[PDB]
Amino acid sequence: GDVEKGKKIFVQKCAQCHTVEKGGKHKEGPNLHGLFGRKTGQAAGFSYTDANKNKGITWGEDTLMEYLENPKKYIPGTKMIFAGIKKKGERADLIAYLKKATNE
Ligand code: HEC
C-alpha cells in the first residue's frame, strides 16, 4: 500500500483517538505502537473492554483488513466507535502506513 495516503487516512479517521509513536499517549483509544504481531488487547496501561481483550487474534495485514472494514462486527461490544472503511485500497494504504509508523 501507499504509506503517504495511509497517513492522510489515519489523520482523517483515527488520529483523534490513537497515537502511533513509541511512548505516545493513550487517548480515547490506546497507543498503537507495536501492534503488528501482537494479540488483541495488549497495549500496556489501557483499559480495554473484555470484548477486545478476549478476541484473541494476532494483529497483522489479514486481521486488520477484516477488522477495519467493520470493527464492531469483528469485535462485538468494542468501545471503539468507528463505522469502518468500506474500500479495500483505502484499508491497504492505511495498513501500510500503520506497519511503518507503529514500528519506528
Ligand atoms: C475513537 C472515537 C476511535 C476512533 C475514531 C478509532 N478508534 Fe481504534 N480504538 C478505540 C478504542 C476506544 C479502542 C479500544 C476498544 C475496546 O473495546 O477496548 C480501540 C481499539 C483499536 C484497535 C485494537 C487495539 C488492540 O487490540 O490493542 C485497533 C487496531 C484500532 N483501534 C485501530 C484504529 C484505526 C486504524 C482507526 C481509524 C481507522 C481507529 N482505530 C479509529 C477508539 C477509536
UniProtKB/Swiss-Prot annotation:
Gene3D superfamilies: Cytochrome c-like domain (1.10.760.10). It holds the Pfam family Cytochrom_C. GO terms for molecular function: electron transfer activity; enzyme binding; heme binding; metal ion binding. It comes from the Eukaryota. Binds 1 heme c group covalently per subunit. Phosphorylation at Tyr-48 and Tyr-97 both reduce by half the turnover in the reaction with cytochrome c oxidase, down-regulating mitochondrial respiration. It is found in: Mitochondrion intermembrane space. GO terms for biological process: apoptotic process; glial cell apoptotic process; hydrogen peroxide metabolic process; mitochondrial electron transport, cytochrome c to oxygen; mitochondrial electron transport, ubiquinol to cytochrome c; negative regulation of hydrogen peroxide biosynthetic process; positive regulation of cellular respiration; response to carbon monoxide. Belongs to the cytochrome c family. Electron carrier protein. The oxidized form of the cytochrome c heme group can accept an electron from the heme group of the cytochrome c1 subunit of cytochrome reductase. Cytochrome c then transfers this electron to the cytochrome oxidase complex, the final protein carrier in the mitochondrial electron-transport chain. This is Cytochrome c, somatic.
